[PDB]
């Protein structure tokens, strides 16, 4: 059995959070929880809520044991972008892209 | 035993039981064809000069086919010259049966 959680339209640039999600891919839920708590990244806060929601979905919804849960698969997808004007010198206006992430975490069960 | 035949402007070593594709033959499927023999090997090393005297091999015709397509394409730069041609070279499939050595 697998259990998943998705955080969509999270207003953090994907490339940044992918750094965090890379730290937990394959880790045990316990190892992943401890990683994020002291991962000095804004991403950690978001990747954490996904992990716990995924953890919760496995226990309540999907007949899975919290002590056997590991991050089977995880990835950040790019949502739409919040395009914003950045005033530059000499009357030029840049377009800043405030990017967005679709954060997914799939938990499996480490059998043994 | 083995021999080296001539067929379709190309020489091939042949042994009995062999499947070999050569140029299209003007023969029917099922029928047999008497190929030349330029040399016999195995035991009797008979070196034709150029063909052996009266020895042949006996190839049964397995059927005819065309080769897998070849996209012959030509291109010249700065001249707008592009050619795209498809090519399926036809072939006759042979089963060698005997080596009348």
């Amino acid at each position: 059995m697998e259990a998943k959680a998705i955080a969509r339209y999270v207003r953090i640039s994907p490339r940044k959070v992918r750094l965090v999600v890379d730290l937990i891919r394959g880790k045990s839920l316990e190892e992943a929880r401890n990683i994020l708590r002291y991962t000095n990244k804004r991403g950690a806060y978001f990747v954490a809520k996904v992990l716990e929601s995924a953890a919760a979905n496995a226990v309540n919804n999907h007949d899975m044991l919290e002590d056997r849960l590991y991050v089977k698969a995880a990835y950040v997808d790019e949502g739409p972008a919040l395009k914003r004007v950045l005033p530059r010198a000499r009357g030029r206006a840049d377009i800043i892209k405030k990017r967005t992430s679709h954060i997914t975490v799939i938990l499996g069960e480490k059998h043994g | 035993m083995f021999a080296i035949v001539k067929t379709g402007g190309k020489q091939y070593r042949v042994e009995p039981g062999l499947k070999l594709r050569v140029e299209k033959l003007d023969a029917e499927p099922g029928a047999t064809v008497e190929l030349p023999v330029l040399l016999l090997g195995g035991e009797k090393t008979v070196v034709g000069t150029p063909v052996v005297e009266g020895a042949s091999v006996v190839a049964e015709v397995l059927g005819h086919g065309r080769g897998k397509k070849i996209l012959v394409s030509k291109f010249k730069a700065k001249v707008q010259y592009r050619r795209k041609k498809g090519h399926r070279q036809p072939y006759t499939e042979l089963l060698i049966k005997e080596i009348r050595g």
């Binding site: - | 091939y12 070593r13 042949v14 070999l20």
Partner: protein
């Protein structure tokens, strides 16, 4: 009927005495051996030549004034880093490199011709430390 492609073999080891021989005309025969072109089953894309061991490199000879007029060259990459080493000075200091640099320059460029050159074992003095290989002698 398709052309024969040799499944691998173990390489044949060969000993050659560079005593008295001429540099280019021995480098020729080593190259051929290194390519493996003396074998009738030669394949251009595989290292299947012979392992050529040379001895008495110091004793190799050259015609004309090439002892002191032929100048080897290295470019260090820095300004004025063009080194100039006449053959005399080469044999004086690193003699085995003469035939080595002649066999290499007659080997094809590319990854294979670099491995083929690694099958070259040039030594000055009659001894070579390749006894475990059983090197045939070749009179060339």
């Amino acid at each position: 009927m398709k052309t024969y492609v040799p499944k691998q073999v173990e390489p044949r080891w060969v000993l050659i005495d560079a005593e008295g021989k001429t540099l280019g005309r021995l480098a020729t025969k080593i190259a051929t051996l290194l390519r493996g072109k003396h074998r009738p089953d030669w394949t251009p894309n595989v290292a299947m030549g012979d392992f050529v061991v040379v001895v008495n490199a110091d004793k190799i000879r050259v015609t004309g004034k090439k002892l002191e007029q032929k100048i080897y060259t290295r470019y260090s990459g820095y300004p004025g880093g063009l080194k100039k080493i006449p053959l005399e000075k080469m044999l004086a200091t690193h003699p085995e490199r003469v035939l080595e640099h002649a066999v290499k320059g007659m080997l094809p460029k590319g990854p294979l011709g670099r491995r083929l050159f690694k099958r070259l074992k040039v030594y000055a003095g009659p001894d070579h430390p390749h006894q475990a290989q059983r090197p045939e002698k070749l009179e060339v």
